[model samples]
Target chain A: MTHRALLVVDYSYDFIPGQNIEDFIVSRINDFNYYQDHIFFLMDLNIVDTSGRELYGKVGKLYETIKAQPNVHFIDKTRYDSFFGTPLDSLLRERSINQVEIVGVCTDICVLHTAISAYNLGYKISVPAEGVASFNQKGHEWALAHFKNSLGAEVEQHV
Target chain B: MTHRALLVVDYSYDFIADDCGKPGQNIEDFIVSRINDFNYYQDHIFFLMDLHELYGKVGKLYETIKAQPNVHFIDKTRYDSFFGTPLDSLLRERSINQVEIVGVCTDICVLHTAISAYNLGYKISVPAEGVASFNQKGHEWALAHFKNSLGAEV
Candidate 1:
């Protein structure tokens, strides 16, 4: 069914290895081998931190790489949880998306928060360990534990 | 004169971690007390609510402090109320320059919105006792980060 999606969360310029994240996601935009048919790119663009600065750069090459695909969706986010205030929930529900596979940067923050929010929103969460990255190794591990424990998310190895 | 607002974030029934699926009454009562104290500037009160249809109890705590003659209610779909919402415009419309944020999920919506406001150059304050979190550590994380990392007053 078309009721599943891959959530790409904030693999932005300052957040991840830009080239690596872009290269990784570009190859899988249409690949459902990991989990779902649709690709939801949760981008952090124009988000301002306490220092009065926007995300270092835009979504960069990834935005250009995935913007044209029929099955790809781009969502601009200002917070860790993508479902908050954005049209993410509405878009997913309209398409009847009941399951999601999350991949992105800031695993301890945005990606992690989105996973928890998605779980609470009644979607089945599947997060590939390698697909997520955080600035701190320990924080990333802690997020994985919470994702599985409180949110009941499933951790899997991506192909 | 700089107007101040009480920005309540995601105090919905579905978000509160409890057996009855309601926000903790203790947190609710604390918020009410804060609202009461700030009733002198009731017009500046802004309540950010998660009003998605799937999540019940959108207005769960409204009545307790509805006595404020001009409480502003801003319904949001995402964690950051300023994203794709009229919160910024509303604040600008009223020339609000200082804000006190409170409510559920201290690590999620509350933290997100507070950061946004601070970035936008609004003076932001977060009372530790007024916020609740689904993750206890996450709540503490945001609090410490807000103070040490984000340079916000907590």
Candidate 2:
């Protein structure tokens, strides 16, 4: 896989409810080439430990395809910001990866928090417009706004 | 009671932990004044800290204050926007009456989540200079969007 990884935050069955921002993020990564050319993975943390329980069968198919792909990356993390205490930096450095695309659940927490961390660490971050969703559209939009304006990240509308 | 009121949002721990932005513009007072309208404490509108979710071991601070009678502090579980939260329920449980907001970090949860709450039937109140955020232009744009586009009164 390349350094230009598309990190899909957490996509646990625990957070796919109508209130999250997962599908929206997935929608932004529409083209198969985007999936083919980038590194992708589900954050794979057991959110069951925090927010709620899982209903695995619901989005199981979407989960399976991403898993079966050869180049896709599956990272398990247990923090709000993915870079805080994780090997993300090391892995990226080893892979010579400098750019990242972020998507997945809870725009404010998972996406925004992680995006800000990427900015602080000097990685080029890009988040597509339809690339996020949250419990509230306004909160989702607000976080993206902050990332674009304050954090100096690029937020796009499509893949 | 006579006058309707608005309560400012949270300026608490992890959310700010330490103020990292501008130092002036302590608009906390202007928000405090609106909350003083009614006689009974019930008449005081609620001020919520858009503390979406507490994590690791730091959640205890919120777990304790969640018990406050009228203050109504909430953990969002997601992001700043108030969707998928019990904000509406907690508001219903206590007679939260209405919401008025002001605080630092207005760029994220402070602004969007408040609009989410306002659209759901509660009267929304925000001050022009009261909310604090890093990108003054974005926050300024948000202030205008909510007040003008969303039909929210300043």
Candidate 3:
């Protein structure tokens, strides 16, 4: 089987735009539990001050259960693409992770950019449709279409 | 004075049938002007061209750029030139941290490359006129999004 990992990008409370992300996260944790060698959490706390407790504390808590598990990594980012300044690429390389299943918020923006980055870097990408949502439904659909048609990505509808 | 590099993406013969646009000024003219105005350190120049046995070659623009010695040519299979390519290592090897990008297919190759490079922490400059596209909306959308959302200087 291909070595697979889960990339959780920008699923923060501040960025969710009021999706039922609690269920989304629960569903994700449940879905990937059976399949993935490693789990990577990408957080964006740019709108807050350093200690991060003031802003990221709640979002961080949301994934507390996931973080408690083994082989789960947490990385902070300033921009949309998690690979921007983070060690995400090297992490995947070191873990021997060739296949990545990305799930996160704002499908049209952060998740979309991350998928593009991953696709360019030559990784096998799959974004479960039920796992990704955006404030704009049309934009979400458009992004998914582009990912599938233009980039040759695999949009796995079922977990 | 600032040290800078230029990135030219996919200006292949198969892509641009004619230099479509206004008579006096066009995408090619914009590209030529940037090349002429620059007093570049040739090694810093990078040309990312899409090459395939099925498609034609890099065209007339390639001939002119080839005349300039020490320029780097990177081949890409996908829209983002940096993806699975030696671009990052090559740039980092030379310690080239600032990049000015221009190319064909504004929405696809040019746009994707800019975002990827930006995320990589490179100071990105997109000479809006130097980049061309098959669709004007794509060209416009990519440039505007680059500046507003992706932190590109255009």
Candidate 4:
């Protein structure tokens, strides 16, 4: 029902203090799929984010299997807000699609920024409540309420 | 005057991890003095602010409250709202300026956008909060929001 392209914010471990919910959200998305289902991802990529700590052992080979999926696009940005740097607005215009589902970590900050910017850009946004999370309880809910209630949104939806 | 600069949104960091008043929010001490004393500071806080969730409960934030009685804090945008924000125009109209320049941090997000503030005509105050530092960058070459590099407020 939304646009054919799904916009995944950032599915990484850094945002999560330890509750990295990649597997959880991935499994929920019908067939362990995400960006693969979407056309492009508007994500934040500070040099700091990419420089993640090394794992003790056994980096998930499943990543390759997951990453190798088809029809995936990635956009890198240094700022917390997507509309600030990347061409996300123009891309959405190019897609001729108004409905965008937002997914990412640090829900309070980054996700909030993306959604507000998207709203300003005039996109019909769909945010899966369980899909995005953050370490903070207040920051998280604050963002949800600020966007959903004040900005004219319906929360806790599926797909 | 402080050395490094990271002109933070508000004084408190209870909402943030490293910046809780007890241990300090996601701030880097060295960076704060740097930003506070940067050559570009407007001798006042009237330029811009990191205003997050303005309509949320945190509206009682010192900066937000202080905004009315005092002409200092400018709180509006949720994120990167500085570019199109009124604070930019305020600086232009008032002559509060940050004429110098430089780069930003990797993981340091606001600092990345702060560059835009620097580009605009305001006392681009930042890094004074001690928020920008790279684990891999010891000599500070890899750091982003250094007051020295960007010529921030001092």
Q: Model 3 residue A115 lDDT?
A: 90
iRMS values in order, in angstroms?
5.2, 12.7, 7.9, 8.2
Off by over 4 Å in 3: A33-36, A48-62, A66-69, B2-154
Docking class of 3: incorrect
* lDDT tens digits, residue span A63-147, model 4: 3344455544556655677666455666666667777766666778778888888888778776667667777889878877877
My TM-score estimates for the predictions, one after another, are: 0.48, 0.42, 0.48, 0.44
Q: Across residues A1-159, which tens digit of lDDT does each residue of candidate 2 receive? A: 245777767656566633344455444344433656455554644643563433233234454556566555555554677764455765677667788888766788887888988898899888766656688778888998898898877887554
Candidate 2, B1-154: lDDT as tens digits: 2234444455554454443324213554444444443324545444455532332122343354344454444433333435434456556565664666666556665676666766777667676766777687877887887777666667
Residues A1-159 of candidate 3: C-alpha lDDT, one tens digit per residue: 458888888766466533555565555655566564687888774454544222233345646666667778877665688787556887789888898888777788889989989989999888878778898879989998987987687887665
TM-score of 4: 0.44
Q: How far off is residue A127 in model 3, in Å?
A: 0.8
Q: What DockQ does each listed candidate score?
A: 0.13, 0.01, 0.03, 0.03
Model 2 score (lDDT): 0.59
Worst 10 residues of 4 chain B by lDDT: B99-108
- Give every collision pair in model 2: A3-A97, A21-A133, A25-A131, A129-A156, A139-B81, B52-B76, B52-B77
Worst 10 residues of 1 chain A by lDDT: A50-59
Which numbered prediction scores highest in DockQ against the true structure?
1
Q: Over the full model, what C-alpha lDDT does candidate 4 score relative to the true structure?
A: 0.49
How does candidate 3 fare on TM-score?
0.48
